[PDB]
């Protein structure tokens, strides 16, 4: 197990494709090393900024972690796309899926007010994203009001 | 009595005790403090290399 771990650490340090990172996560999951999976994801989002990587991390924390971590990883995702918006790394569809996922997760946790604040502040930050407005429409049609 | 206890505590604080005062926990304490970004939360590249590359400008050349 320790040799396999050192092998994955070297491989990932050489900046390989997403397949190697996914395999390393699967390895630590086999080891039930949840802190190792957090550390790998902490590196993986830097090596592969695509929004599916962040959503893989939040998907992990939902099944193998506490809600404090899940909120903190979503907050890292938004703070990251907000600070790095000037690079245009993510497409609008990616940021939209991140915000919608975060809003629906806060809606599941019965904190509809914090999802509403999330949608308002995110729309204020990125007014050019139509997909984000449509996501607010989808949310408001089932959790909002008629007016 | 409680106001007196608070007074005694504040005195002991002033006269002695005052002289002695993972990614997600770091992120939470950074969030508390907030009441480039990557280099403060992450601790070593890709995003740094890309932003550093985008900041510069290639020299202009006339078309052939």
């Amino acid at each position: 197990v320790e040799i396999v771990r050192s092998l994955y650490t070297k491989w990932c340090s050489l900046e390989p494709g997403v397949n190697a990172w996914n395999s390393f996560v699967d390895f630590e999951i086999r080891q039930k090393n949840w802190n190792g999976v957090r550390e790998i994801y902490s590196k993986y989002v830097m090596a592969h900024p695509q929004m599916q990587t962040w959503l893989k991390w939040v998907r992990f924390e939902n099944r193998h972690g506490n809600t404090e971590f899940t909120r903190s990883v979503y907050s890292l995702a938004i703070d990251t796309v907000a600070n790095l918006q000037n690079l245009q790394i993510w497409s609008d569809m990616e940021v939209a899926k991140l915000v919608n996922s975060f809003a629906h997760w806060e809606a599941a946790q019965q904190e509809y007010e914090r999802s509403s604040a999330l949608y308002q502040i995110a729309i204020e930050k990125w007014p050019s994203n139509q997909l984000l407005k449509a996501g607010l429409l989808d949310f408001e049609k089932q959790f909002g009001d008629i007016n | 009595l409680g106001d007196v206890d608070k007074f005694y505590s504040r005195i002991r604080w002033n006269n002695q005790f005052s002289y002695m005062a993972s990614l997600l926990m770091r992120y939470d304490t950074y969030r508390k403090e907030s009441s480039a970004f990557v280099n403060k939360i992450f601790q070593p590249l890709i995003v740094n290399r890309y932003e550093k590359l985008l900041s510069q400008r290639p020299e202009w050349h006339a078309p052939w």
């Binding site: 050192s6 092998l7 070297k10 340090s13 050489l14 900046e15 | 290399r49 550093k52 590359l53 510069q56 290639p58 020299e59």
Partner: peptide, 25 residues
């Protein structure tokens, strides 16, 4: 340990001039 693929280093793949175009050669 650092015995695995000792000769392979990330810095060998990174172009040195991307961080500073005006680097002197």
């Amino acid at each position: 340990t650092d015995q695995i693929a000792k000769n392979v280093k990330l810095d060998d793949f990174i172009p040195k001039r991307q961080s500073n175009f005006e680097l002197s050669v």
